[PDB]
Amino acid sequence: KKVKKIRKIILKEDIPDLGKKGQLLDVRAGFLRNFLLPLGKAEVVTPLLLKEM
Template sequence: MGSWKKKKKVILKEDVSELGKKGELLELKAGFFRNYLFPLGKAQILTPLAFREMRIEEERIEAEKKRVKEEAEQLARIFETVGAFKVKRKGGKGKLIFGTVTAQDLVDIIKAQLQRDVDKRIVSLPEIRETGEYIAELKLHPEVSAKVKINVYAN
């Protein structure tokens, strides 16, 4: 093993806490690589083939992220062109309604009107306890959100 230098360039095969994420290129002490990362299969020495594979994987991941963001933007356009979602609740005195309009109510209405499944955890609503017009925000992607109008009526 005379070819070992003090430092080695390695590629991580998986996330390693305190060190880096999968696919990251690092320069580490040879002993740490040889005695810890390599036996556990967490890293490999940088070779031209491994480097090429790493680049291909990065490009695939970037393309997937771009596709997901484009889908979210398309969904945001659909939500914003729909107009307002109408919610009917049993009315109380004046503008008050019985109960509140929740994120789950909005998710059910979206599913009924647009045939789209939306996770209620991405919906942020103001507290709705009376009739009127409200704006809800749907966080479809870390960089894409859509605002939808909700009209609450008492019957």
């Protein structure tokens, strides 16, 4: 019926699958909620933090 969107993440730690600490490979919102955001492992791409830093 419907598909849920994909949320952007910017890394802070080496993914054992795809990304080494700095890539912008966007995966899933639930993979950010349950796994990446509590473990200090990814962040949300915001223009206030990415563009000026």
